[PDB]
Design a protein around this nucleic acid. Structure first.
Ligand SMILES: [Mg+2]
Ligand SMILES: [Mg+2]
Ligand SMILES: [Mg+2]
Ligand SMILES: [Mg+2]
Ligand SMILES: [Mg+2]
Ligand SMILES: [Mg+2]
Ligand SMILES: [Mg+2]
Ligand SMILES: [Mg+2]
Ligand SMILES: [Mg+2]
Ligand SMILES: [Mg+2]
Ligand SMILES: [Mg+2]
Ligand SMILES: [Mg+2]
Ligand SMILES: [Mg+2]
Ligand SMILES: [Mg+2]
Ligand SMILES: [Mg+2]
Ligand SMILES: [Mg+2]
Ligand SMILES: [Mg+2]
Ligand SMILES: [Mg+2]
Ligand SMILES: [Mg+2]
Ligand SMILES: [Mg+2]
Ligand SMILES: [Mg+2]
Ligand SMILES: [Mg+2]
Ligand SMILES: [Mg+2]
Ligand SMILES: [Mg+2]
Ligand SMILES: [Mg+2]
Ligand SMILES: [Mg+2]
Ligand SMILES: [Mg+2]
Lengths: 48, 144, 260, 185
RNA sequence: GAAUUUGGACAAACUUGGUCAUUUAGAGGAACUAAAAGUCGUAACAAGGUUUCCGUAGGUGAACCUGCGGAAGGAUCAUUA
RNA sequence: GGAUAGUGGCCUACCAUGGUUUCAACGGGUAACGGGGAAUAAGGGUUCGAUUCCGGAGAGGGAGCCUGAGAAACGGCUACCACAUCCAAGGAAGGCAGCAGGCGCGCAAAUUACCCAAUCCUAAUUCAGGGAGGUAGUGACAAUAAAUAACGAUACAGGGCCCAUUCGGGUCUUGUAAUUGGAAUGAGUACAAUGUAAAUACCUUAACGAGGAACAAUUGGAGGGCAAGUCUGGUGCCAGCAGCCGCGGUAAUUCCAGCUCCAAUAGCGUAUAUUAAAGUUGUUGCAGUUAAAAAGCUCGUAGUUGAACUUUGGGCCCGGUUGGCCG
């Protein structure tokens, strides 16, 4: 909502990397460290 | 012979025939009759400011009953009344009457068996603030 | 518009000046003078773009104002003076002499010239005619009017002109089998021998020309400009000798002059 | 009134947006080579495409025709200087068969990791944009430099750089000052 | 040689009616709407019509019949030559 | 004949009775300046072109004219019409569709900045002048490039590679742990210099400048189309619900909130227009018994279309440009 005047630049859980880095993450989330669940590639599962 | 002249000195008949036949296309007819400049409420522009005439509680029945929280808005440039959707807003605490409202297009087709009609516009801005930003509690509304 | 225009936009300048297209927004509109606008080279262009002798425009005016630069024996002091085809240009402080003749690739070229060739000049005879008190004269392409020529000289003939006195040394007739520079048009900048002249009345005459590599082409008479005889030109041609090569030939010749 | 500064797009967005196969292919392609946008891939696809067009337009014309000769040979020798096309495949019909990876393999990014100045490809990114990595007398800081072949045998560290030579960086002399001042005390 | 004046061509614009075409402010009147409310008419009342169509004519009426000419876009069994 | 710089019904007299037209004149429309060109398509096309170059037209609307080589000129003049300013009420001035700036209008568009240093133009002219032009300001119109992290060790955790007879001999790749360690660097700040008409910036560079528990990345989605939920609670009085179609209600993958994940990423959504998709405009290339669509039927002018046939066949010579077998 209201960030106070102090947006003057000059004078929680872990974050996700941005840009290139993020893609890297995905490349290993899907191809270096493959997770084969129930005979399929499951993305976003809870308890199974 | 596939029913069209196929002769080498036959161009005129061909192209004339084409012109007389393009009037069955829909958009072409809109485009050469200036339907956009003569009838369409927006006058052929991607948006229009209007002032909320009346808060409408339309009720559109089948197959899904919308407690249609919609609006009668009157466009400033035409003095032309229009109905318009005001999205994502449960309570309509955002849009009151006599309020300036920037409208856009909106493609809800109306249905027959339940007398639900097709409004063609959604509120994009109220009083200069974006409906979205209000709804995100990102920006606040100057109320006059 | 209403009167004559006095500007020239950058893009609209004749292309073969090779003006770059971000230097400015305008381009030196040639003054009125001896040659046609489209096919002449303003001294500023010749001086700053092709000799690199001056960097700005005012440097060029600076140069011109010391009576340094001569054109056809005489001193011109107009930044936009229109020196065109076959004109002699003199830079005395460098003791250099230039001739404006066309490169093979249809543009104007720097050409150094001995003092003994700087003295004279060729002129295509654009029209002979009889003036007041029955005195016959010619009018040669650079605009020069010469009186009392030799009666053998009709149209399209070339004339040698002593720049000093402005009189006619000799001339050349327009017959089959002469040497010829082609001035306007696509084949502009070529040289060859005139096979035969095609005569179309009330229309444009053409000329078939065959160069030294025995290849042929055709241009309107309008652009044919006589030089001399078979291999006996009256002026010194540039390197290239008006012999135009396919892009393949030029590619090869360039890549074959690289051995470090 | 200027000349209008010409300019052009560089890439092209795919036609079908969600296509599980293309999606993956793309991801593995970004993975081999550490790209950050799909856009980086598209840019390649697009240059490739313009070349395949020039290719075909030459192919449909007669052999021993001046144009196919000239522009053919040019396109060929151009593709060869960057070593996208191999020495032995010097005829048009192969430049069609060319694929994306053949282009993606000549990036400075890539060649830095394949001349072993970097540990991983990502390392090569960082090392490039970090103004570390020179090609001869020039520094270069674009991951997409497209190394010509005669410039392969020159790539090294920058004479400016900490690794290339010179003095240690800001962090290094920071810790040098910290330890030296902490020991003087 | 200035003010001024004769007649021309050029010709803005004005006045007047007449005429269409609009912008208007008013008044005359008529008709449609319901996230309005209740009232009767038949809602809260019961069924009946069901070859279907085409052109045309008429009748009306709350609808629908009806005359004439067309069409199947309508379900060929049986015997025999 | 007159007029004009000049041809010319351009105008004036006098004669004729012509000129255009279904090969679409004339009139009406254009939210029409024309072209070079732009977007998009395999091709063929369709659609844009107010706008950087060329040509034309206008300077609130009309008309008239001086000066001059050149103007029917408006940063010249005169009048009328529309607006509008100053007045001491007599009069006198006014055209930003030049640069800035204001109002109004709207969905919709920047500074009342610096300079002739480039570019070029004008003048009696090297010097003067130029909101032409250039420079900076504003600005997510666009277009290009591309930071937001790279490593390591450690341990825990596992898989795999060879000696497994079992410890261990090491290679490798991973999951981690708001774990550690020391490297790197421009975002920003700043001497100087460079740049520059003067500056701003860029590029250079001393000096600073992160573990980055915040130099913290977003915008849309997660029933289908269409990439991604077999996750918890709430709902179910603000509730099957709004591009299209789906789908229920104690227990909902389909609604609401959080968690998670997906896509494109310094950008992403939405609206209108337009091209593709659209072989749903069909010349290339549609369809017409029953899905929309063969005129009730023949005749007939324009139009489109139209059988066959008139030096073939043979003989000689000349010289080119690729390709072979030799070099
Ligand atoms: Mg002009
Ligand atoms: Mg020509
Ligand atoms: Mg217009
Ligand atoms: Mg197509
Ligand atoms: Mg235009
Ligand atoms: Mg307009
Ligand atoms: Mg113009
Ligand atoms: Mg004018
Ligand atoms: Mg105005
Ligand atoms: Mg004058
Ligand atoms: Mg005027
Ligand atoms: Mg003005
Ligand atoms: Mg003017
Ligand atoms: Mg202005
Ligand atoms: Mg000046
Ligand atoms: Mg300007
Ligand atoms: Mg932009
Ligand atoms: Mg300085
Ligand atoms: Mg989100
Ligand atoms: Mg959905
Ligand atoms: Mg979906
Ligand atoms: Mg799916
Ligand atoms: Mg169809
Ligand atoms: Mg039917
Ligand atoms: Mg039918
Ligand atoms: Mg029939
Ligand atoms: Mg025939």
């Amino acid at each position: 909502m209201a960030k106070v005047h102090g947006s003057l630049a000059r004078a929680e859980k872990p974050k996700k990397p941005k840009g290139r880095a993020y893609k890297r993450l995905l490349y290993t989330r899907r191809f270096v460290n493959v997770t084969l669940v129930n005979g399929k590639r499951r993305m976003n599962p809870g308890p199974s | 012979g596939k029913g069209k002249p196929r002769g080498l000195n036959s161009a005129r008949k061909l192209r004339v025939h084409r012109r007389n036949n393009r009037w069955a296309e829909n958009n072409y007819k809109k485009r050469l009759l200036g339907t956009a400049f003569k009838s369409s409420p927006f006058g052929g522009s991607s948006h229009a400011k209007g002032i909320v005439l009346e808060k409408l509680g339309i009720e559109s029945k089948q197959p899904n009953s919308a407690i249609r929280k919609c609006v009668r808005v009157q466009l400033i440039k035409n003095g032309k009344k229009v109905t318009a959707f005001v999205p994502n807003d449960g309570c309509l605490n955002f849009v009151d009457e006599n309020d300036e409202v920037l409208l856009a297009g909106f493609g809800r087709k109306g249905k027959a068996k339940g007398d639900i009609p097709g409004v063609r516009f959604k509120v994009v801005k109220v009083s200069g603030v974006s409906l979205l930003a209000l709804w995100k509690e990102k920006k606040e509304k100057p109320r006059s | 518009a209403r009167g004559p225009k006095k500007h020239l936009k950058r893009l609209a300048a004749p292309h073969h000046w090779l003006l770059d297209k971000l230097s400015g927004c305008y381009a030196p509109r040639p003054s009125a003078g001896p040659h046609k606008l489209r096919e002449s080279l303003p001294l500023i262009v010749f001086l700053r773009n092709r000799l690199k002798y001056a960097l700005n425009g005012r440097e060029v005016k600076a140069i011109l104002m010391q009576r340094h630069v001569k054109v056809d024996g005489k001193v011109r002091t107009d930044t936009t003076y229109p020196a065109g085809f076959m004109d002699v240009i003199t830079l005395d402080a460098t003791n250099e002499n230039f001739r404006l003749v066309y490169d093979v690739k249809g543009r104007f070229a720097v050409h150094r010239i001995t003092d003994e060739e700087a003295s004279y000049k060729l002129g295509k005879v654009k029209k002979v005619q009889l003036g007041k008190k029955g005195v016959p004269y010619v009018v040669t392409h650079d605009g020069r009017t010469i009186r009392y020529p030799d009666p053998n000289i009709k149209v399209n003939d070339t004339v040698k002109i002593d720049l000093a006195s402005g009189k006619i040394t000799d001339f050349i007739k327009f017959d089959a089998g002469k040497l010829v520079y082609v001035t306007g048009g696509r084949n502009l900048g070529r040289i060859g021998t005139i096979v035969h002249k095609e005569r179309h009345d009330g229309g444009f005459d053409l000329v078939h020309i065959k160069d030294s590599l025995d290849n042929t082409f055709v241009t309107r008479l309008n652009n044919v400009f006589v030089i001399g005889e078979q291999g006996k030109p009256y002026i010194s041609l540039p390197k290239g000798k008006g012999i135009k090569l396919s892009i393949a030939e030029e590619r090869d010749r360039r890549r074959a002059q690289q051995g470090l | 009134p200027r000349a209008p500064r010409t300019y052009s797009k560089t890439y092209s967005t795919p036609k079908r947006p969600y296509e599980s196969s293309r999606l993956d292919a793309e991801l593995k392609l970004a993975g081999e080579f550490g790209l950050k946008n799909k856009k980086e891939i598209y840019r390649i696809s697009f240059q490739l495409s313009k070349i395949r067009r020039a290719a075909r337009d030459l192919l449909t014309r007669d052999e021993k025709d001046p144009k196919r000769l000239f522009e053919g040979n040019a396109l060929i020798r151009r593709l060869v200087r960057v070593g996208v096309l191999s020495e032995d495949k010097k005829k048009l019909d192969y430049v069609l068969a060319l694929k994306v990876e053949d282009f993606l393999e000549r990036r400075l990014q890539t060649q830095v990791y394949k001349l072993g100045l970097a540990k991983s490809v990502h390392h090569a990114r960082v090392l490039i944009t970090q103004r570390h990595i020179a090609v001869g007398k020039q520094i270069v800081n674009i991951p997409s430099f497209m190394v010509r072949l005669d410039s392969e045998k020159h790539i090294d560290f920058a004479p400016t750089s900490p690794f290339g030579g010179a003095r240690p960086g800001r962090v290094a002399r920071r810790n040098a000052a910290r330890k030296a001042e902490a020991s003087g005390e």
